[PDB]
Amino acid sequence: LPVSMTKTSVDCTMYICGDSTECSNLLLQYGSFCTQLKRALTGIAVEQDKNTQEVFAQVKQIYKTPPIKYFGGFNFSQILPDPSKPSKRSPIEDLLFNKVTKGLTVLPPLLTDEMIAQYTSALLAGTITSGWTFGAGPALQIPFPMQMAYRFNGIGVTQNVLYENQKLIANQFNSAIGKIQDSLSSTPSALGKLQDVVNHNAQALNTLVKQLS
């Protein structure tokens, strides 16, 4: 799911008239079109920043996973952050990053990718260690197999189904996550919903620039 696009800003007089002073003198009496366009683009930029903040910053705590990463057979190494990498990112999100490629300026986002990765890591640690209680108040730690048993109780299956098939469920989950990793590494168009976003915005700018000719 896309969240925010590239924030762009325009210098109205510089784009319209360039370095001709008489052009600016003639321009100043067409009114406040430049002010309107600057206001609209600033509104879009702040809306993009608010969108990112709302979608990601949903927890007021930055939880940290315990050093001993054993969860009753479940393997979360594919989605947990990798300490060795300087970027502090899991293999899946690193694959995602590697899989996606005057008068007009591009403003950088307020939240860098590192802070977004930190929020995602906090959410993962919270939802792994403390179930779903951390989203409704304090964080309540709980063993992971018990959380999965609770989640089966959510869908109308008693816990004895889980507790007597824990190893099989763990193996199936690990195999499924490996298959997802390989599928992401194999299909190029799977990220199209994001890619076209860029492939839209950039080309739009190009067309605008072509209008100078």
């Binding site: 007021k60 930055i62 950088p108």
Partner: protein
Amino acid sequence: NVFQTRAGCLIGAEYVNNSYECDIPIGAGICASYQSIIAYTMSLGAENSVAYSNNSIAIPTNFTISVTTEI
């Protein structure tokens, strides 16, 4: 009093090693505020490490009836 940021060059405010919440957004993880004008790296939130273990649970013992407003 010159600072170099990813967005650009900032003059008139001093960088502070301390971290707070964002007040005026500048960009690239930098936010400025007035307390003199100081620019800093915004703080995501208070870190809270939860003691997870495979044979321990935490049970609430009390409750609170909260009221929130949404406009």
